[PDB]
Amino acid sequence: MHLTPEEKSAVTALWGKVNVDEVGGEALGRLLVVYPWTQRFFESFGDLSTPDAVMGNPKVKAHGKKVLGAFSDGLAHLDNLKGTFATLSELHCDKLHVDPENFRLLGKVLVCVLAHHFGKEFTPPVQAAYQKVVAGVANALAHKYH
Amino acid sequence: MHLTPEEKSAVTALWGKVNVDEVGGEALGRLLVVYPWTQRFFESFGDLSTPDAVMGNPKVKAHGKKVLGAFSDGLAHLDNLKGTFATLSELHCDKLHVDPENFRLLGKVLVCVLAHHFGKEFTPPVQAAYQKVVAGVANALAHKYH
Amino acid sequence: MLSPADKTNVKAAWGKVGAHAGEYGAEALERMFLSFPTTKTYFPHFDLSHGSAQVKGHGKKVADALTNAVAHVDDMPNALSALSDLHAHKLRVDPVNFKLLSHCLLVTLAAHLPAEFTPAVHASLDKFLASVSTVLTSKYR
Amino acid sequence: MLSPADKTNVKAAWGKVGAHAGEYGAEALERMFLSFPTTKTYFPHFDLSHGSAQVKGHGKKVADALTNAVAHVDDMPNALSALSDLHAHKLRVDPVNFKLLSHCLLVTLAAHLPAEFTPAVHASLDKFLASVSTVLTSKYR
Numbered sequence A, B: 001m002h003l004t005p006e007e008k009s010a011v012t013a014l015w016g017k018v019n020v021d022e023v024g025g026e027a028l029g030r031l032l033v034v035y036p037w038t039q040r041f042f043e044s045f046g047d048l049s050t051p052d053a054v055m056g057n058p059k060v061k062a063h064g065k066k067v068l069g070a071f072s073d074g075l076a077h078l079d080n081l082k083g084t085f086a087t088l089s090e091l092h093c094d095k096l097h098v099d100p101e102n103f104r105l106l107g108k109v110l111v112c113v114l115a116h117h118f119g120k121e122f123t124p125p126v127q128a129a130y131q132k133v134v135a136g137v138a139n140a141l142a143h144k145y146h
Numbered sequence C, D: 001m002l003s004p005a006d007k008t009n010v011k012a013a014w015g016k017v018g019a020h021a022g023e024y025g026a027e028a029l030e031r032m033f034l035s036f037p038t039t040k041t042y043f044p045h046f047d048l049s050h051g052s053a054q055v056k057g058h059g060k061k062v063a064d065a066l067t068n069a070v071a072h073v074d075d076m077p078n079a080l081s082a083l084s085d086l087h088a089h090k091l092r093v094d095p096v097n098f099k100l101l102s103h104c105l106l107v108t109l110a111a112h113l114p115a116e117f118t119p120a121v122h123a124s125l126d127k128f129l130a131s132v133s134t135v136l137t138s139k140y141r
């Protein structure tokens, strides 16, 4: 993934301020609320009946934390996303059957969450750098589909 | 751009039968008929008011021929489409102001036209190989956008 | 969005499909699975090999639904209501995939209808399949 | 597609935007041009530098139209009729770009409405912008 030094620094500096578990829970919860077809994978998580029940579901939060923790560690390998996420790509295709469009929807929701969380600090150029990153991750996770 | 031996053979064998002029004129004309907002780039071409006017318009046929001729030259460099189309990519961005989504629409229509022309010879696996190639060419043409 | 000429074009082309509607549905699916492999993620319970009877059976159901849409072209939201419910609340197929199957249906019709697939009919069929896709995803959210 | 509760959510959120609508419209365009550079192909006649008067003026026109849509949410096709024509017949912007502006407008509201941008309001605003986009592209074909 190619980012300028300036873009890379902007990504890392904001990420240093993120509570990965909180943001993970929030982004996965909003994904399931805003694009509810994504709930199809999570019927074992229990009550997803209302926005409040989703956001408060302990299983949703726990998965949010797992997903964003992997995202977070990926931010340390921005020059090698494809090889960093290769095994997870294979897992999501062959065993979990997750349409890669879902990675793109999560990317949109995460950007919205960071804007909500950081307000004016989430400037247009900082957003632009994060748009590259979430596209890059979604592409890296889709790479081994077949 | 990587194609399997089977995918490359399918592409090359079919293309040997294509009359670039005739197919190019058909594919551009159908683009202008089926997605008529694309006509915004061709105001100086004359009468585009009806499907019969579009398909028989000589400036459409001539431009169609130029476009598929350059596409054709790219099939001879499938291992490096980005380097092959770099100059045309800059042209389409900086001088023509063409939204690269148009390259994808042309890709879809071209596949329909090959199906229409060749019928049963355009099998599901041959289509699949062509879908990879039209996606690769569109991505190569959008690469120098900024 | 479907003009009287569009409706006329769709009925003429689909009428020519006739008793092959099932066979063309199956071929469209096979084109879709090979050209757009991410769509396979919705069918892990199927044999997707060429000639599979699961794919043929599903293609007949898709085609039959489209025949019903054509016959009710002026009343499609009602005629497809139960199918809209099923896709929105149970199958939950991402709306992007409907464009991919629609494209593969168009390619299939082009390959089998040499005389009928004129530019005008192509435009009307594309509009028709976009309307059907819109109806099928209308209750998702 | 917009339920009564969605309409209620949009009106409260947009009411909160209030007099800042024009400024937020300008910010959403700048976010779009920076994040999705292909959208700049529609504005080669503009100075797209930050804070340019053309961009601020265009932002205000976009915001005004959305205010009109919020005020007539139960009759949006009628309300945005002239704008539907203009995009279909003259501007002819590819429909995919409306999704990109919609996303940047949502990001802009998130960044400015911390108290109001709850999960449910987020969902309603996304739906609302998709309906606006649908109306503006409805006469393209």
Ligand code: HEM
Pocket: A038, A041, A066, A067, A068, A070, A071, A088, A091, A092, A096, A098, A102, A103, A106, A137, A141
């Ligand atoms: C940035 C995107 C994503 C990343 C980095 C990611 C990462 C992960 C990780 C680390 C696992 C654990 C695998 C293991 O246990 O070895 C996982 C599992 C899973 N993910 Fe993804 N994921 C992402 C997006 C998604 C999305 C958008 C969905 C679906 C809406 C999804 C659905 C699942 C499912 C169903 C599981 C299995 C959970 C379980 O078995 O408990 N993932 N993911």
Ligand code: HEM
Pocket: B038, B041, B042, B063, B066, B067, B068, B070, B071, B088, B092, B096, B098, B102, B103, B106, B137, B141
């Ligand atoms: C496979 C995709 C394409 C290829 C290989 C291609 C190639 C070319 C070439 C070789 C030229 C000639 C430039 C010159 O005269 O120096 C050109 C010009 C042009 N192309 Fe593209 N093109 C493609 C797709 C498109 C599409 C889809 C559109 C817009 C819907 C488009 C719009 C134009 C325009 C407006 C011109 C200029 C015509 C004029 O001089 O009046 N192109 N293209």
Ligand code: HEM
Pocket: C039, C042, C043, C058, C061, C062, C063, C065, C066, C083, C086, C087, C091, C093, C097, C098, C099, C101, C132, C133, C136
């Ligand atoms: C023109 C669009 C479509 C039509 C007319 C259509 C129609 C149908 C019909 C008639 C059924 C069977 C319902 C029954 O048993 O009564 C079905 C099932 C199904 N559809 Fe759709 N469909 C369309 C597009 C799609 C797309 C784009 C996908 C996914 C790529 C999809 C995935 C499925 C799945 C997974 C099933 C269930 C198969 C099974 O387990 O038997 N559909 N569809």
Ligand code: HEM
Pocket: D039, D042, D043, D058, D061, D062, D065, D066, D083, D087, D091, D093, D097, D098, D099, D101, D132, D133, D136
């Ligand atoms: C929510 C979506 C949108 C709304 C409500 C909207 C509304 C408007 C309005 C109110 C005008 C000015 C009409 C006038 O006063 O004459 C306009 C013009 C324009 N729009 Fe749209 N628009 C939207 C999305 C888009 C998109 C996605 C693009 C392109 C990326 C676009 C490109 C343009 C252009 C190029 C102009 C003309 C600018 C000028 O030369 O002054 N619009 N739009």
